[PDB]
Amino acid sequence: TCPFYKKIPGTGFTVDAFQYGVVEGCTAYFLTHFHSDHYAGLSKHFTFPVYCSEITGNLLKNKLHVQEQYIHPLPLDTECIVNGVKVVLLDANHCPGAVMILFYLPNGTVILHTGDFRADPSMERSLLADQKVHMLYLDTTYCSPEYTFPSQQEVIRFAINTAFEAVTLNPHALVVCGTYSIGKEKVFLAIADVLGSKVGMSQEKYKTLQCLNIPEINSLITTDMCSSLVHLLPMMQINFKGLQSHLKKCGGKYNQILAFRPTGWTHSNKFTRIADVIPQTKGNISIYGIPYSEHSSYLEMKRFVQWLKPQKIIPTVNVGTWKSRSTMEKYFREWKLEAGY
Ligand code: NI
């Protein structure tokens, strides 16, 4: 049964709740972003309204094959009425097309649902700054003080330098980047751009990217592998056995792979900086793990929440155990007591 944290009080609106069958009472299913835990259940045989961003719209139409009539795309930063309730979509700073939703209830209650987000100070000068938010449905993926990681800009700077050095030392080296969903496109586009290449990828991954409204994208990507010295692979395939395999397939055009695995947090964040990173090396294949996050660090989350000063916080991540639930409530109480709300 659909959990209470996927339902919006006093509306017939649900958020990211496509895997339960029909939810009784629901006039409208919101989708925050095209990631599979959130969309799970959507297919060509959905005949209820889905509201989402334009980009998420393109992905539902072309990858899942949902029929045009059930997809309602909304623009961002625009007051819109949806079944007689004012709503706003705001950039979540997560993956392409990912949004937060502002709900203005008839009773006067204002509710913010973050979907998945990476909190940023630029959000403090958006439409959010204009009025009080009473209820916050919060992405708590990294709600614990151990979770630190660098800025996205720091990580891209590292990647660009690594790749450029290695290719300028050895012009027959190949850069591979791992992938499994949308998200983190800056990693491979930054590398490609320093190296004067397009990025080469399978037909399914090329199709996924052509839905994202990226500017000049036709100049940045291709399905012709041979012509490209930055390649995308399934993240499953980023290991020595699978890379070796792939190094064969190129047919004596490259002698060395330099690969990146953009991970979330890993326990080596607790003891090592970004300037001091090292790969695993089995011959001519090296594999970097780089902690490029599209979720809030603990301190980023804490700051956005202490600015917002919400009357109530409902977690949407790590809610399946009583220990996580209890631990999270503790942080919300400290935050509130520190900040005086
Ligand atoms: Ni996500």
Side-chain angles (χ1 to χ4, degrees), residues 58-74:
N58 304 337
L59 289 156
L60 293 182
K61 179 187 161 182
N62 287 293
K63 300 302 296 172
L64 292 175
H65 303 291
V66 168
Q67 303 163 64
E68 196 138 306
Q69 73 197 141
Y70 309 113
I71 302 171
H72 295 261
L74 304 169

Side-chain angles (χ1 to χ4, degrees), residues 100 112 114 117 119-120 123-124 128 136 138 296 299-310:
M100 314 185 290
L112 177 61
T114 65
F117 88 137
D120 192 77
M123 294 166 178
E124 297 163 29
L128 286 175
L136 176 64
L138 183 57
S296 323
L299 288 174
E300 291 169 349
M301 193 183 296
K302 186 183 179 277
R303 176 194 169 118
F304 169 85
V305 174
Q306 284 185 314
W307 177 77
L308 199 65
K309 302 181 174 59

Side-chain angles (χ1 to χ4, degrees), residues 33 35 38 94-95 116 295:
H33 64 293
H35 272 167
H38 298 251
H94 185 53
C95 65
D116 280 359
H295 293 278

